[PDB]
Every structure is written in structure tokens, then in C-alpha cells.
Design a protein around this ligand. Structure first.
Ligand code: P5S
Ligand code: CLR
Ligand code: MG
Length: 993
């Protein structure tokens, strides 16, 4: 609408504004009230197929042009227009209703008279909206105040950038210290926010409070921002709205909704142009035959109007009803429940997808992490062997009051239970207060919260074996044992996990003994040299990683009361430095990071969704290349790629390093080129450089890959990847996602599928097809797409064949029977009127199937045939053209040569022969017979016999009730259809499908 400018947002009072802000509404609609009709009309009549009808109809306005009745040109086109408008309108009402659930969420705001309850749509910039726990943040906000005593909160941004880690967000310091939540309305404070941009992980702002005698100014960053679409993980937060509606950071990354057309529709449109060009060519030949006879422009276009039915409106009507039937079938399948079809005009696109691009967090995975393996070197403990770890812990803490394997197991478990950054949170269950449960350490009211879900999984696992961690402070940590006694540990040093070191350490003192213990856990690559000599770390960690687990190496070092003093004195000496602090403390910690005894290796798995591995294997077996485009980190993405068998166990993986320029990109691209049959894992930062500088080479190397993993992808980068896959290959692409970061690539893709997320519905609402589970994709692609594509191709080709046969024989009639007469047009309106009796058996091809639904799924290789364009091609169309020409020529020439008396004794023969030939041809193309096709074929014959009976009494047509009629009809019906019967049977025999 307007240029982006920084905004001064006053806390409360949503009226001190200079620019009007958009309403906070998420809209997936295509058109508004005003632009609905023009948009639909243009999107319909922008193609040759639909514009042909308009060109035909408009000509009826020139008096020297008029041919036929006026109501025959506009009633069918009017029906087509009215069905298209109705379909689009109903789609719009359904989209608006589906958007209402998100746009009508209930929240609360702070007013001078007290809190009041308002909806999500009415949220204005500058409003103080209260967001509770496990509630989606409605609009972009600034963290002001939280009800938690530690002055912070955790955010789940899985629906914003697809990252599984929880984001720790800190409130505004000035607003946090106010005595009550009602105090922010009596302070003259404002937030100066940057212009709404597409970046989601950055924010530059400033908080200013003018009320205080010393003005207080805070510099705001991403750590104070609660973007829309995120979920508050803990506590009740209060924020000030900065952006609304389109201005939301989620919406800037969302493209405008577009109307999609399938490739099958484009091929049919090209066939219509070919037909019209052939008509024009024969027109130029026919006029040039007479060496120009004056007013040629009149006669040639009059003859065009005479053959105007070579492109039938029945084609468009049949395709529309077939697509409606396909959508009705998809919405009613019980083996893929919950499937929703939004774009009901492209069900045939599911049958020609060559590339599938999917999100990891929430689509492939369940967004749940649990502990899988505890490897102690000499023995591993799986999910079925945890009762021995529990037994060892119980035995030790029973023998405490009443080396060995139990001691080693306990030492390995306690290190996991202490070397972490997880803090318990206690809530009031309703009977016991929050302060009531803390002093007794209630199990039902205790929740573990941390930035890394792996640490939460480890803590929850140690809870299961007996060592329950019940409290944690900045200098203390309590563990609860099976003997119900509590051990008190004092946290003397903590080294938080960093993505560069890839390790986390801690130093604790056991108050019962006083011994100093140093714990360190991290990746195997960094802990290979820290731990002492061993012979199983590099092998067992590699095996556990190859199984798809997140391996960690846990180590120990017992510190005496003398090795700690010199370490503390040097650590603080490094800390109170004014020159190169980081490298100073790094050396102090590294000096302690020596000769650590190895305890155990841990395996934590991100729980996939149901039937993800079989679905990926099914899609791989059908020639579909599956790329995982995720916004998560490299390690989690690789672990999920290995877990889901997106890469085979023996497959080699090349990790794309961090490249920053053109020269650095040449070397890495070439080095990857020297590899063979190796999957590619690339970060977003390297992808940006490769796509900016090496657009051709990167994709010519990535399309040959068995699979491609691209982590930390911005939504624009995902959409760009989809766009290049569409452009440089020319093959259809499918995009699967569950969050708001997948909407861009879902809309960009030729067929976008949106998995309904657990905490968000944007991808579901903005996709052509919405599924509840990832495993439904296999059926949706192998059955509901293949059947729709095949049925649409068959019915379109049969309709074209019928019209071509009618036109060919009716051209023979007008040429070799009279060559000039008014009574020609009475016959030249009726022998093309047969399509009232054969219309039902033509609308019975939407019930046809080549193989059973359980056979396409069990043999996905049938899809590789559709990937080649078999159902509709130039060879099949040419064969149908030859068949139609042969049938028309045979019917008319045989009718004329066998017997020739006058017009009304040949019209009857030709009409019945054409109807019977078309019915037989309908019966010819069927592969598996359905009873509705049988009833349609029988009802057609019954109606034709009824018509030939009623007219017999009124019109003297006694020719029908003779023997000379029967053999004359049945010889043409035998020489027109049955030669193709023989050909089809011999095709079955010699070349089975
Ligand atoms: C009033 C309209 C008359 C009309 O279109 O006739 C039906 C036509 C027959 O051609 P004609 O009338 O001889 O053509 C005159 C000249 N060429 C002209 O158009 O000036 O035949 C056609 O070209 C067919 C047009 C009818 C519209 C499409 C068929 C109806 C639906 C078919 C599919 C579904 C069938 C089953 C429904 C559901 C069953 C479960
Ligand atoms: C008079 C003609 C042109 C039209 C009406 C007859 C048609 C609809 C009839 C005649 C013979 C019939 C077939 C005869 C036998 C079987 C085997 C069984 O699995 C049921 C379907 C199937 C395959 C029938 C399908 C319908 C069928 C093809
Ligand atoms: Mg996701």
C-alpha cells in the first residue's frame, strides 16, 4: 500500500497514530466483493478453449453473420459461466468460514477501567493484549511483563520458522518491575519500532519512558519480541502490538493467493488451438479451390460457424463435472480421513508430480523427543531394557542404608541428570497451590522447560529410572531418589552450550560429601579428544548416529579441593580482563577439559509421524524426488533425514560447508561434483551464495542427487527452490508443510499440500489439498491423483473423438449428397444432435479404474508411467483422430452406397448407426466394469428405442420396422466399431499393458 517507515508505538492508547494500520486479519481469499466477478471472468476467458465460445456467440450480432437460433449460442455458455461462478463463489465462502476460526480467537486487553475481552481481528497496533500459556500469539508484540518470578518466558516458534528449540524471551526491564499489571496504563512510554520487513529473526527498536525524571531508554532486539504465530510455552505474558494484518512478519513471508491451472488443462487448451488451426487451414484450402469468388471473408467464416462444433462445449461441461466428481471422491475416502480439497479444479495434477518438497518440523516428525539408547560400552540399554537401569538405581539406593555394574549405571545416569540446563516449573493443579507443591515436589504439577528439547527428554528419562530432579536454582540443584531422600548439589560453575563448541559443561559439589565433580556432554566429534583412551566411542557413536539418533558423549572428572582453587583463581582472572576476554576464558576451560573419564553415550530420537518411512519409500519407488526443505539446524535435519530413510544406510552424505563468495563456491561445488551417488546437505547461507552466483551449476548438480537436504531455509528460499525446480526442469513440483513458513512454497508449487499442524493451521488453510497426516500423501498421490488424471484424459479424448466423428461424417453428408440446399441445414442440425443419447455413457468414464486401489499402492511403479505423459499425448490424440475420421467416413459412405432413395430414409440409418457406434466405442474403452456404466448404457438404448417408437406413430417412418433396416444398420455398425474391437483385443494379446 505505502512505503515502509519506522513507527512510534505508544504503550496503550491505540489512537496516537499518524498512519492508518491494516486490520489484524489473516485472509486466504482470492477475490474481494468488488474484484470477484472481473477476476473470475478474466481467469476463465483468458484461454483459447473458453474464448472460443465468446467468439462464436459474439458473431450472432452481425445480421450478415447470423446462423442458427440465438438461444443455442448463449444458453450453453451461460450455463458454463453460471456453474463456474457458483463453484468459485462457494470456494470463497468456504475459505472465509475456514479463516473465521483463526480470525475470531479470543484474547484480553488492559483498559483504564480494567481488563476486557476482545477478539483477534479487532487487535490494533499499540494495544496491550494478554497472552496466556499454550496460546498462539495473535499479532507481533514486544515482551513487556510476565507473571513468572524469574522474569522470562519460553516461546515455541515451530509454526513461524520451523525450529524445535524453544526461544528464551526477556521482557522490558522497566515494565517488569512495576508493582501491578495496571501500572503500564499510567506511564508515558512508547516503542520506536523499525519498518515492517520480511526478516523474522531480527528486530531493531527502542523503548522510551518519559514519565521517569531520568528518561529511560532501552535498546530492543529479537530477545524481546513475540512474533505472531508463536506459542507462549510458559506463563502469562503482556505485550504491545507493533504490526497487524499484512504487517505481521508471518504475512510478509506469505505470497498473494493465486488461481492455479493444471498441465492437463494446458494440454487440452493446446489441442483446441490445434483443432481450430486445422479448421482454418481447410478453410483457406476450400476458398482457394474456387480461385476467389467475391465476399470470401463472409463465406469462409460462415463455414467456420457451420463447423463450429468441432470444439464442443460438452468437453468443458464434462471436464467440470468430472473434476467435481473427483473432489467429491477425495473428500469421501475413508482411508485418508480429514482430507480437504480447496482448489477443486486441479485433481489431475496429483498424478504427474516429479518433485516433492517437504518440511521436517511438524510434517515428517511429531515434534516429540524421547530417550532411546543409553550405551555404557560393554552393554547398551534400549527402550525394552530400562527396567535393569531402574533396578540398578533402586539397588544402589536401597544398599545405601542397608566396579559393580550398578555403580557404573548410576554414575552414567547422574551425569545426565545433572549436566543440563533444565529448570522445573510448578503450577497449581487446582487443589494444591503453586507454593504448596514446591515444598513437597509434586510429580503431577512439575514441568521441565529448557531451550533444547533433547535435555528435557534426558531429564524426563532420568525421572523414569528413579533419579527425579525436583528443583533447580542459579546455584543449587536437587535430585529425588527412590528412597525419597533429596540430594543437594551446589552449582559452582556452568558453561552453557554454544553452537561453536557443541558441548556443555557444569561443575557441582555434593553437599552430602563435598566432592567436586565436573560434567561435560556434547557431540562425539568434539569429545573424541577430551575423553580418555577407549575402543568403542568412535564405533558405537557412529552406529547410533547412523540409526538416526542424536548422540551425545558424557564424561566426568572428579576435582579435589585443590585442583579447583587454582582453576577458580584463573577463571576469575580471565573474566576481569579488558583485552581478549573470550580467548582468555576459552583457554581456562580447555585446560580443565583434559583426560575426562568416559561414562556413557546417549541416543535421543525425534519421533516421526505414523508411516513416514513407508510413505517415503513409496514416493521414491515411483520416481518422485523428495527434498527436505526445513528451517531447523543442520544436525537435527540430518538426524531426521537418517531416521526417515530419506537417505539410505549405505548412502554417502556430503555436507556443504560455509561459503561466502564466488571463489569459495567454485571449490566446494567442484569438490561435490567429484562425488558420486552422494546426498547433499546444504545450509541456507551457502544456498544463497550458490543460487546467486552458480544458478545453473548448483541445480544441474542437485537434480542428479538421490536426495537433497537444505536446512535453515527462509520461506522465500523455499519458494525460490520450488520456482527453480519448476523452471529449469519443467516438471511438476509438490510442496508439503505444516507451518506458516511453508505457505510461500505451498502457493508457489504446482500442487501444495498442507499438513494440519498441532498449533497452527496456516499451511492447511493456504493449500490446495489439506491432509491431517503425512502418510495420507501416498494414497492421495497414487490413487486419487492417478485415477483423476486417467479419467480426465480418457473422457476428454472420447468427447473430442465423438465431435470429430460427427463433424467428419456431416462434412461428407453436406458434400456428396446435395452439395447445396436449404434442407441440408435441417439435417445439419440433427446428425450432430445425437449427443443427448450417448452423453450418460460418456459421463460414465469417471467411474473407470485400470487397477484396484490396493494394487496401485502395492505397486507404485505404475506412477512412473504417468510421469511420462502416457494418458494424454500426441500419439493417442492422433490415433483418436484417425479413428473418428474412419468412423465418420465409413458410416456416411456405407449408408449412401448401400441404399439411396431420399433424405429422410438415410437420416434415420445414419443417426442410429452413429448412436450404436458411439455406445459400442464407450464399451470398448472400459477396463473394469461398474454397474452404473451398465445402467447408463441400457438407459441410453431404452431412450433411443422409445424415441424411435413415439415418432413412428406420429411420423410415417415405417422404414424402421422392417428387415432391410436391421441388416443395413448392423453392417455399418459392424464395420465401424468391430475392426477396432479386433485391434484392441490384439493389442491386449500381443502387447499387454
Ligand atoms: C440449447 C442447446 C442445444 C445444444 O447444445 O445441443 C446439444 C448439442 C448438439 O448439437 P446441436 O444442438 O445440433 O448444435 C447446433 C449448433 N452446432 C450450435 O451449437 O449452434 O450437443 C452438445 O454438443 C452437448 C452440449 C450439452 C452440454 C453438455 C452436456 C451435458 C452434461 C454432460 C455431462 C454429464 C452428463 C450426466 C449428468 C450426471 C449423470 C449422473
Ligand atoms: C447393447 C449394448 C451395446 C449395451 C448394453 C450391454 C452392456 C452394458 C453389457 C453387455 C455385456 C456386459 C458384461 C457381461 C459380463 C460381465 C461380467 C461381470 O463382471 C459383470 C460385468 C460384465 C463385464 C458386463 C458389463 C456390461 C456389459 C458389457
Ligand atoms: Mg513445520
Amino acid at each position: 500500500g505505502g512505503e515502509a517507515r519506522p513507527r512510534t508505538v505508544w504503550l496503550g492508547h491505540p489512537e496516537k497514530r499518524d498512519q492508518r494500520y491494516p486490520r489484524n486479519v489473516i485472509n486466504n481469499q482470492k477475490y474481494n466483493f468488488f474484484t470477484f466477478l472481473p477476476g473470475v471472468l478474466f481467469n476463465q476467458f483468458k484461454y483459447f478453449f473458453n474464448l472460443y465460445f465468446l467468439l462464436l456467440a459474439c458473431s450472432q450480432f452481425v445480421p450478415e453473420m447470423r446462423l442458427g437460433a440465438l438461444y443455442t449460442y448463449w444458453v450453453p455458455l451461460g450455463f458454463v459461466l453460471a456453474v463456474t461462478v457458483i463453484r468459485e463463489a462457494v470456494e470463497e465462502i468456504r475459505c472465509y468460514v475456514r479463516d473465521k476460526e483463526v480470525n475470531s480467537q479470543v484474547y484480553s486487553r488492559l483498559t483504564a477501567r480494567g481488563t476486557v475481552k476482545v477478539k483477534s481481528s479487532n487487535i490494533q497496533v499499540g494495544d496491550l493484549i494478554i497472552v496466556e500459556k499454550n496460546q498462539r500469539v495473535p499479532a507481533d508484540m514486544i515482551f513487556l511483563r510476565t507473571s513468572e518470578k524469574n522474569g522470562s518466558c519460553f516461546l515455541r516458534t515451530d509454526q513461524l520458522d520451523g525450529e524445535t528449540d524453544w526461544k528464551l524471551r526477556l521482557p522490558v526491564a522497566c515494565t517488569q518491575r512495576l508493582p501491578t499489571a495496571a501500572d503500564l496504563l499510567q506511564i508515558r512510554s512508547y516503542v520506536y519500532a523499525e519498518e515492517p520487513n520480511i526478516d523474522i529473526h531480527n528486530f531493531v527498536g527502542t523503548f522510551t519512558r518519559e514519565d521517569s525524571d531520568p528518561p529511560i531508554s532501552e535498546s530492543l532486539s529479537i530477545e524481546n519480541t513475540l512474533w505472531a504465530g508463536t506459542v507462549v510455552a510458559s506463563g502469562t505474558v503482556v505485550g504491545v502490538v507493533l504490526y497487524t494484518g499484512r504487517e505481521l512478519r508471518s504475512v510478509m513471508n506469505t505470497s498473494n493467493p493465486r488461481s492455479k491451472i493444471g498441465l492437463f488443462d494446458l494440454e487440452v487448451n493446446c489441442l483446441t488451438k490445434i483443432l481450430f488451426g486445422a479448421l482454418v487451414v481447410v478453410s483457406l484450402v476450400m476458398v482457394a479451390l474456387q480461385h476467389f469468388a467475391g465476399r470470401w471473408y463472409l463465406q469462409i467464416i460462415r463455414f467456420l460457424l457451420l463447423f463450429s462444433n468441432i470444439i464442443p462445449i460438452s468437453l468443458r461441461v464434462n471436464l467440470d463435472m468430472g473434476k467435481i466428481v473427483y473432489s467429491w471422491v477425495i473428500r469421501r475416502d475413508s482411508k485418508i480421513p480429514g482430507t480437504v480439497v480447496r482448489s477443486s479444479t486441479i485433481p489431475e495434477q496429483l498424478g504427474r508430480i516429479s518433485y516433492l518438497l517437504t518440511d521436517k518440523t511438524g510434517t515428517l516428525t511429531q515434534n516429540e523427543m524421547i530417550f532411546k539408547r543409553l550405551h555404557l560400552g560393554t552393554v547398551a540399554y534400549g527402550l525394552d531394557s530400562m527396567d535393569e537401569v531402574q533396578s540398578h538405581i533402586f539397588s544402589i539406593y536401597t544398599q545405601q542404608s542397608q566396579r559393580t555394574m550398578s555403580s557404573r549405571v548410576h554414575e552414567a545416569v547422574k551425569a545426565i541428570a545433572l549436566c543440563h540446563n533444565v529448570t522445573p516449573v510448578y503450577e497449581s493443579n487446582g487443589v494444591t497451590d503453586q507454593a504448596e507443591a514446591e515444598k513437597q515436589y509434586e510429580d503431577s504439577c512439575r514441568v521441565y522447560q529448557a531451550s533444547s528439547p533433547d535435555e528435557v527428554a534426558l531429564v524426563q528419562w532420568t525421572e523414569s529410572v528413579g533419579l527425579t530432579l525436583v528443583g533447580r536454582d542459579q546455584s543449587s540443584m536437587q535430585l529425588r531418589t527412590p528412597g525419597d531422600q533429596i540430594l543437594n548439589f551446589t552449582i559452582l560453575q556452568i558453561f552453557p552450550f554454544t553452537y561453536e563448541s557443541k558441548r556443555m559443561g557444569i561443575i557441582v559439589r555434593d553437599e552430602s560429601t563435598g566432592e567436586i565433580t565436573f560434567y561435560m556432554k556434547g557431540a562425539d566429534v568434539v569429545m573424541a579428544g577430551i575423553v580418555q583412551y577407549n575402543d568403542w566411542l568412535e564405533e558405537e557413536c557412529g552406529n547410533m548416529a547412523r540409526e538416526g539418533l542424536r548422540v551425545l558423549v558424557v564424561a566426568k572428572k572428579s576435582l579435589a579441593e585443590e585442583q579447583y582453587q587454582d582453576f577458580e583463581a584463573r577463571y576469575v582472572q580471565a573474566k576481569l580482563s579488558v583485552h581478549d576476554r573470550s580467548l582468555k576464558v576459552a583457554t581456562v576451560i580447555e585446560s580443565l577439559e583434559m583426560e575426562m573419564e568416559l561414562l556413557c553415550l546417549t541416543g535421543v530420537e525425534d519421533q516421526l509421524q505414523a508411516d513416514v518411512r513407508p510413505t517415503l519409500e513409496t514416493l521414491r519407488n515411483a520416481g518422485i524426488k523428495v527434498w527436505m526443505l526445513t528451517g531447523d539446524k543442520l544436525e537435527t535435519a540430518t538426524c531426521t533425514a537418517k531416521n526417515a530413510h530419506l537417505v539410505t544406510r549405505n548412502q554417502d552424505i556430503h555436507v556443504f560447508r560455509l561459503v561466502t563468495n564466488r571463489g569459495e563456491a567454485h571449490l566446494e561445488l567442484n569438490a561435490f561434483r567429484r562425488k558420486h551417488d552422494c546426498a547433499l546437505v546444504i545450509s541456507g547461507d551457502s544456498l544463497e551464495v550458490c543460487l546467486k552466483y552458480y544458478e545453473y551449476e548448483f541445480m544441474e548438480l542437485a537434480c542428479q542427487c538421490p536426495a537433497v537436504v537444505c536446512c535453515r531455509c527462509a520461506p522465500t528460499q523455499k519458494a525460490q527452490i520450488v520456482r527453480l525446480l519448476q523452471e529449469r526442469t519443467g516438471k511438476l513440483t509438490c510442496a508439503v508443510g505444516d507451518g506458516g513458513n511453508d505457505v510461500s512454497m505451498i502457493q508457489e508449487s504446482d500442487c501444495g499440500v498442507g499438513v494440519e499442524g498441532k498449533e497452527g493451521k496456516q499451511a492447511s488453510l493456504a493449500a490446495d489439498f489439506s491432509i491431517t497426516q503425512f502418510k495420507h500423501l501416498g494414497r492421495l498421490l497414487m490413487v486419487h491423483g492417478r485415477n483423476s488424471y486417467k479419467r480426465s484424459a480418457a473422457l476428454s479424448q472420447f468427447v473430442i473423438h465423438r465431435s470429430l466423428c460427427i463433424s467428419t461424417m456431416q462434412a461428407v453428408f453436406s458434400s456428396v449428397f446435395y452439395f447445396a440446399s436449404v434442407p441440408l441445414y435441417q439435417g445439419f442440425l440433427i446428425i450432430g444432435y445425437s449427443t443427448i443419447y450417448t452423453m450418460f455413457p460418456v459421463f460414465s468414464l469417471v467411474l473407470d479404474k485400470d487397477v484396484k486401489s490396493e494394487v496401485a499402492m502395492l505397486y507404485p511403479e505404475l506412477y512412473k508411467d504417468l510421469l511420462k505423459g502416457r494418458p494424454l499425448s500426441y500419439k493417442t490424440f492422433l490415433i483418436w483422430v484417425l479413428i473418428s475420421i474412419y468412423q465418420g467416413s465409413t458410416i456416411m459412405y456405407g449408408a449412401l452406397l448401400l441404399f439411396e432413395s431420399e433424405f429422410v430414409h438415410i437420416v434415420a440409418i445414419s443417426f442410429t448407426s452413429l448412436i450404436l457406434t458411439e455406445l459400442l466405442m464407450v464399451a470398448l474403452t472400459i477396463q473394469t466394469w461398474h454397474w452404473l456404466m451398465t445402467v447408463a448404457e441400457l438407459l441410453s438404448l431404452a431412450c433411443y428405442i422409445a424415441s424411435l417408437v413415439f415418432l413412428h406413430e406420429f411420423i410415417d417412418v415405417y422404414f424402421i420396422a422392417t428387415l432391410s433396416f436391421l441388416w443395413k444398420v448392423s453392417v455399418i455398425t459392424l464395420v465401424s466399431c468391430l475392426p477396432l474391437y479386433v485391434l484392441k483385443y490384439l493389442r491386449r494379446r500381443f502387447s499387454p499393458p
